[PDB]
Amino acid sequence: MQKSNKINDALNQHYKLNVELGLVYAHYAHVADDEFDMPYLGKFIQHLSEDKLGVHKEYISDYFKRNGMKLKTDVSVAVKSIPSDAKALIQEVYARENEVRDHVKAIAKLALAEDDYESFYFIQWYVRDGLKDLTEVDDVVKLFNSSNDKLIIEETIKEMVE
């Protein structure tokens, strides 16, 4: 029956987070290619950008249509400083994906507290994807600690963003 307002707000914020994250990553992808001369790192980060700005926000929008929750569009993001090198750039992406896992955990917890079993279900996809996206990112961070050669690292990323 009736929609939970708490869940509605929590999913609107997550909508907001995926929009703004995806806009940050689109900038980070540009810089990976341009300043840092790592176009495959940039193609890995652009695919993560399109992920956040696509299905991560689409599923919420579609879910709201089915249960009567209200969509809210309030976006504010400015990319004001860039990490100093490619390593720090991908470590930054990592840190935001770890925060994704913490936010979706709060939403699952709330859904059980509300007895919103439809929302707990809806969020199970995000529960899993939080770890998948974090793992894929972690697989790139590891590269910068396994070789000091930008072109070696780039050649390895190629086989990941194929």
Residues that bind its own copies (CB under 8 A): 1, 19-20, 23-24, 26-27, 30-31, 33-34, 37-38, 53, 57, 61, 64-67, 71-79, 98, 101-102, 104-105, 108-109, 112, 115, 117-118, 121, 124, 127-128, 130-131, 134-135, 142-143, 145-156
Q: From CA 141, how far away is CA 93, in angstroms rounded?
A: 9
Q: Report what 81 binds from its own copies, Fe ion, none; CB cut-off 5-8 Å by kind.
A: none
DSSP state letter for 70:
P
**Dihedral angle at the C-alpha atoms of 27, 46, 53, 125, nearest 10 degrees?**
-130
Tokens 């910068």: give the residue: 144
Q: Are 39 and 152 in contact (CB under 8 A)?
A: no
Backbone dihedral angles phi then psi of residue 161, each to the nearest 5 degrees: -100, 30
86 binds, among Fe ion, its own copies, none (CB under 5 to 8 A by kind): Fe ion
Residue 7 interacting partner from Fe ion, its own copies, none (CB closer than 5 to 8 Å by kind): none
Binding to Fe ion by CB under 5 A, coded x per residue (else -) over 85-124, reads xx--------------------------------------
